[PDB]
Design a protein around this ligand. Sequence first.
Ligand SMILES: Nc1ncnc2c1ncn2[C@@H]1O[C@H](COP(=O)(O)OP(=O)(O)OC[C@H]2O[C@H](O)[C@H](O)[C@@H]2O)[C@@H](O)[C@H]1O
Ligand SMILES: Nc1ncnc2c1ncn2[C@@H]1O[C@H](COP(=O)(O)OP(=O)(O)OC[C@H]2O[C@H](O)[C@H](O)[C@@H]2O)[C@@H](O)[C@H]1O
Lengths: 208, 215
Amino acid sequence: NLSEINLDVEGSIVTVKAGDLFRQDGFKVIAFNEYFDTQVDDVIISHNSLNGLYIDNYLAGSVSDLDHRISNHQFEEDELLEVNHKRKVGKTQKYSLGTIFVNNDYLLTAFSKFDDKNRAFLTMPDYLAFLINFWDKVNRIYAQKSVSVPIFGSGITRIKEHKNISDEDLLKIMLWTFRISEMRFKFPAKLTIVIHKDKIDKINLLDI
Amino acid sequence: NLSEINLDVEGSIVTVKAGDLFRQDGFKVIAFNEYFDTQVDDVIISHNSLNGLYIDNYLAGSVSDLDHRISNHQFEEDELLEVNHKRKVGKTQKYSLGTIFVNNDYLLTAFSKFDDKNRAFLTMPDYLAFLINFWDKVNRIYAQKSVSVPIFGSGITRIKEHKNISDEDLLKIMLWTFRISEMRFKFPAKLTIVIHKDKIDKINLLDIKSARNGL
Ligand SMILES: Nc1ncnc2c1ncn2[C@@H]1O[C@H](COP(=O)(O)OP(=O)(O)OC[C@H]2O[C@H](O)[C@H](O)[C@@H]2O)[C@@H](O)[C@H]1O
Ligand SMILES: Nc1ncnc2c1ncn2[C@@H]1O[C@H](COP(=O)(O)OP(=O)(O)OC[C@H]2O[C@H](O)[C@H](O)[C@@H]2O)[C@@H](O)[C@H]1O
C-alpha cells in the first residue's frame, strides 16, 4: 500500500514511483514507433498511448515542425535503417530501436515496430534489445542526469508470444536490463520509473 | 561450499548444480557457432571449448558424417541465414542464433558469431536474443524432457562491451530469460544448468534465488 521505493542497483539509486510521467522534472521518455510516426488517428498512433498524448496535449509547437526537425536531424549511421517504400500510410524511414530524438526535455525513442498485420508490436528479443540499447544510450549520454520513463511495452504493444505479460514483469525486465547496462558505467543516468498513479494496485513495490 | 540448488521458476523446478555436462542423463546442449563449424584446430573451433571437446571425444561417427547430416537437414526458413562466400576458412552458411541441430542425445546450437578473425563474440542483445529463442525452442520441442546446459558464454566468447562479465551474472541472465520463456509454456523443459565442478568457486548459489522471481 505504498507508492515509491528507492533501489540500490550496482551502486546507484533507481526510483520507482506512482505518478504522472508528464509532471516529472528533467528528461521524460516518450515511446514512438520505428518510423517516428506522428499521425494520431487511433489506428497508427492511439490517442490513449503516451505517444498520442504527448503529441496531442504536450508537444510544444506543431506536429509539422516536429516532422521537419526529425527529418532534417542527423543520426549516427548505426541508427538509420531501410526505407519501407511500399507503405500505405505514415513515414517511410525506419530507425533502429532505441534511437533517440531529443525534443526539449523529452527523449522521443523508436520503441515499437509497426505493420498493418500486427500494428504496434515487438518480439521479446526486440523488446530486450530495445532496453539494452536504450539504457546504454542514456547512461553514456545522460550520465548523472534525471531520466524518467514509463513501463515500456505495457500499453497496446503486442509483445509477440507474450500478449498477457503483466506490468510488474515488464518492470522487472526493465530493471535487470538496466542493471546490465550500467555495469559498464561508473556514473549512469539517474533513472525514475513511473507507474501511472491509478495503477499502483497492479504492482506490489515490495515484490522489488 | 554449496554445490546444488533446486528453484521453483514460474511453477517449474530448475536445477543448478556443479558437475560434468557430459555425464548428464538426457539431452545435453553444446554451443556451436553460427556456421555450425566442426573443424577443431584452434583456428576455427578450439580443443578447449565444449564445442571442440564434444567433437574430439564424444561425437558419434566422423566429423564428415556430421557435416553432411547438417547440410542435408531441413532447417526452418528463418533459421537459415545468408551465405558468407568471402570466408577463407570454415563453413560459409550462416545460421540464426538459437538454431538447433539434434544429434542423438546432444542438442547442437548456433550460439556465437565469428568475425573476420574467427573470434567468438556476441553483443549483449545477441546474447539475450539467443537465450529467448533457444529457451522458446526447447520448451516447445522438448517439453517435460530433461535438458542440461552449461553457463553459455562463460567460455572464450567475448560479449561485446561486457568483457569481464562474471559467470554468476551470465547464470542469472540465463535464469531470467528462461523464466520469461516459460511464462508462455505451462509444461516447459526440465532444465538443469551445470556449473563445471572446478568452477563452483566462482558462483554463490545463494545470490541466485532471487532470479526465480525475475529479480
Ligand atoms: N501519465 C502517465 N504517467 C505514467 N504512466 C502512464 C501515464 N499514462 C499512461 N501510462 C502508462 O504507461 C505505460 C506505457 O504507456 P504507452 O506508451 O501508451 O504504451 P507502450 O509502452 O506499449 O507504447 C505503445 C507503443 O505503440 C504506440 O504506437 C506507440 O508509438 C508506442 O511505440 C502504460 O501502462 C500506460 O497505462
Ligand atoms: N564438462 C563440462 N561440464 C560443464 N561445464 C563445463 C564443462 N567443460 C567446460 N564447462 C564450462 O562451461 C562453460 C561454457 O563453456 P564453452 O561452451 O567452452 O564456452 P561458451 O559458452 O563461451 O561457448 C564458446 C563459443 O565459442 C566456441 O567457438 C563455440 O563454438 C561457442 O560458440 C564454461 O564456463 C566452461 O568452463
